[PDB]
């Protein structure tokens, strides 16, 4: 694979690592999740362009739309949680255990 593909895949890995290793704000986790979507967009776009997969040039757009939908969902959940607790701290989500 070309070094650019390696860099994009590494970007996805880094964003995944940041998402899985929360710190305080749930907003930061959502940012990492959306970053991963961006990296996947770039990867798929490069692959489709290089392969000249003309009929599959619509795949990145569909990925982008669904990505932003699931984000709209995440944000809506974050504001519900913040309105209930006062902050978007991940530690606040502690009522449910095990």
């Amino acid at each position: 694979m070309p070094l650019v593909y390696m860099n994009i895949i590494m970007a996805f890995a880094i964003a995944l690592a940041g998402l899985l290793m929360y710190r305080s704000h749930l907003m930061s986790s959502l940012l990492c999740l959306e970053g991963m979507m961006l990296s996947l967009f770039i990867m798929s776009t490069l692959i489709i362009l290089n392969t000249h997969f003309t009929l599959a040039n619509m795949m990145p757009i569909i990925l982008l739309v669904f990505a932003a939908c699931e984000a709209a969902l995440g944000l809506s959940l974050l504001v519900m949680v913040s309105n209930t607790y006062g902050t978007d701290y991940v530690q606040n989500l502690n009522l449910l255990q095990c």
Binding site: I61, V65, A71
Partner: protein, 106 residues
């Protein structure tokens, strides 16, 4: 390289002006306003966020509507027209849902 040059020149010009407006004008001595930012201490209303999420979704649907000019060149004009009208009808339906139900409160 031309577009990259334009971006570089614009950014550098703006940053240089910001330099000559943030650090150059403050060199002139104007005594000292010994005036503390007296602060002594949250409107997270849905009225704002709702305007934001709905915009996100409508912008997403607009993204699907962007390829339309090139899509008019297809031989399968009937099918393309039906799909375009379908996407527009869905946009209108989403707007109607929000309007008919408790939405568009802005």
């Amino acid at each position: 390289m031309n577009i990259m040059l334009t971006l570089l020149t614009n950014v550098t010009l703006a940053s240089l002006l910001v330099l000559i407006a943030f650090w150059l004008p403050q060199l002139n001595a104007y005594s000292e306003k010994t005036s503390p930012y007296e602060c002594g201490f949250l409107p997270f209303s849905m009225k704002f966020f709702l305007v934001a999420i709905t915009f996100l979704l409508f912008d997403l649907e607009i993204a699907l509507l962007l390829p339309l000019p090139w899509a008019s060149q297809t031989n399968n004009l009937k099918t393309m027209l039906t799909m375009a009208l379908f996407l527009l009808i869905l946009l209108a339906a989403s707007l109607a849902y929000e309007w008919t139900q408790k939405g568009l409160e802005w």
